[PDB]
Design goal:
alpha+beta, ph1033 like fold, 7-stranded mixed beta sheet, globular, binds 5,6,7,8-tetrahydro-4~{a}~{H}-quinazoline-2,4-dione, YTH domain-containing protein 1
């Protein structure tokens, strides 16, 4: 059912994550971690102390899809190294701290199914459009997450307890 999901999302904040390759999103799914450049690191840390839920929604460039969404369970901290595949012109020290995350949905969602959702914080372009880190406004954020196929392998009871 959808009810506990609607509970987790209540008064959440949402952020579009754009990844260059599937390899890093797979690593995020397996280890429960994400890291960003300092510009986004700072904004995620503010949002983490400002809302009961900060949701990251992941998209792999050129995939035509979202790959799932997760909630932050900590602010960023500097631990066990993470063997990210780094783009041309980037090294591991340029990355910021490591955010812990609890996945809420690990299934895909194709852009064709979110083509009625516009993001007011990005000039009302379709929600799929946005730079890495772009905030998605509350109402669009919620409906985007509800569009995902349910992930019956996830139990939001433990997630609810961290709120
Ligand atoms: O915000 C970013 N997060 C990541 C995560 C993994 C390395 C590539 C990467 C990046 O280039 N930018």
């Amino acid at each position: 059912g959808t009810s506990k999901l609607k509970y987790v999302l209540q008064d959440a904040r949402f952020f579009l994550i754009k990844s260059n390759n599937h390899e890093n999103v797979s690593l995020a799914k397996a280890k429960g971690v994400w890291s960003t450049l300092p510009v986004n690191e700072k904004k995620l840390n503010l949002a983490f102390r400002s809302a009961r839920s900060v949701i990251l929604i992941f998209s792999v460039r050129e995939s035509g899809k979202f790959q799932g969404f997760a909630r932050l369970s900590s602010e960023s901290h500097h631990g066990s190294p993470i063997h990210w595949v780094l783009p041309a012109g980037m090294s591991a020290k340029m990355l910021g701290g490591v955010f812990k995350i609890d996945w809420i949905c690990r299934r895909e969602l194709p852009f064709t199914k979110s083509a009625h959702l516009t993001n007011p914080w990005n000039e009302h372009k379709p929600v799929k459009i946005g730079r890495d880190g772009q905030e998605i406004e509350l109402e669009c954020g919620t409906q985007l997450c509800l569009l995902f196929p349910p992930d019956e392998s996830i139990d939001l009871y433990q997630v609810i307890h961290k709120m």
